[PDB]
Structure formats: C-alpha cells, structure tokens
Amino acid sequence: GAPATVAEQGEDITSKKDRGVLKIVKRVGNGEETPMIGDKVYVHYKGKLSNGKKFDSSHDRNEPFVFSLGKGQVIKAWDIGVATMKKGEICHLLCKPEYAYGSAGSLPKIPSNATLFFEIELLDFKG
C-alpha cells in the first residue's frame, strides 16, 4: 500500500540522509542473512510510477531479476535497498530520481525526474 506511508515513516537508508531511498519492511527476512557486494542476488519485484501505474514487474515474465550486488548494474536505490535486505524479506522502497533515473529518465517507461516505488522480494543470494 501507500507510498505516502513510506514517505512519512520509512527508514532513510542513504549514507547522506537526504531521504532519497526510504524503506519499510513488509515481510521479515530469514536468518539475520544478507548478501555482500559482489554476491549474486535473485529478486522478485514490482515498479510503480508515483501515479500508481506499473512500469515494470518480474511477475510479467514470471522471471526473477538477477544481478551482482554493489556493482552499479542496477539503479542506486537497488544496490542500496537490496544490501539492507535479509533473505526471504519483502520491502517497499520509495526512491528519489537522484538514486533512480535522475532528470534524464528512462523513456518510454520512466519520464524525467521520476520518483519510483518498488516492492522487492529477495528470494536468494549466492557467493
């Protein structure tokens, strides 16, 4: 639910504390278990524009999005967000354009200066 709640109540998980990435845990992850930079991460996810319209989802293909954590292969908010996640955890990220696609956007999906809302589930990670 509610991007306005992530805004009001979320945790600022940026080192800068500029509120560019804000998080709320929706399901508590298992172990106190998290990837490190370089680990292979498998996520399921949904991306909404702040008009609620969904621009991209791993549930459309039914295919986990896989990547190397911490290597800039994804937007900054994901390298950041996912590094704070435990295995099995679902969270909600409100992300400022600064940590997403800036004032360039990623057309045609994402217009310029867009605040993005993600639901990311960390399914698994490997070394």
Describe the 3D structure:
With 127 residues, the protein is of the alpha+beta class. It has a single domain (1-127), classed as Chitinase A, domain 3 (Roll), CATH 3.10.50.40. It has helices spanning 3-9, 58-61, 76-83, and strands spanning 11-12, 21-27, 40-49, 54-57, 65-68, 90-95, 116-126. It is globular, with a radius of gyration of 14 Å. The chain starts with a helix and ends with a strand. The modification N6-acetyllysine is found at residue 16. Residues 30-118 form the PPIase FKBP-type domain. It is found in: Cytoplasm; Nucleus. This is Peptidyl-prolyl cis-trans isomerase FKBP5.
Features:
7-stranded antiparallel beta sheet; Peptidyl-prolyl cis-trans isomerase FKBP5; Chitinase A, domain 3; alpha+beta; 127 residues
How would you concisely characterize the structure shown here?
This protein is an alpha+beta fold and 127 residues long. It has helices at 3-9, 58-61, 76-83, and strands at 11-12, 21-27, 40-49, 54-57, 65-68, 90-95, 116-126. It is classed as isomerase.
Order of helices and strands: HEEEEHEHEE
Summing up helix and strand content along with how strands pair, one would put the structural category as: alpha+beta
**Helix proportion of residues, in percent?**
10-25%
The amount of beta strand, in percent, is: 25-35%
Question: What coarse outline follows from CA principal-axis ratios?
Answer: globular
Number of DSSP E strands: 7
Query: Mind telling me which CATH architecture this is?
Result: Roll
CATH overall fold name = Chitinase A, domain 3
The oligomeric state is monomer
Q: How many domain modules?
A: 1
* CATH class descriptor name: Alpha Beta
Instruction: Let me know the largest β-sheet.
Output: 7 strands, antiparallel
Number of helices: 3
User: In angstroms, what is the radius of gyration?
Assistant: 14 Å
End-to-end distance: 33 Å
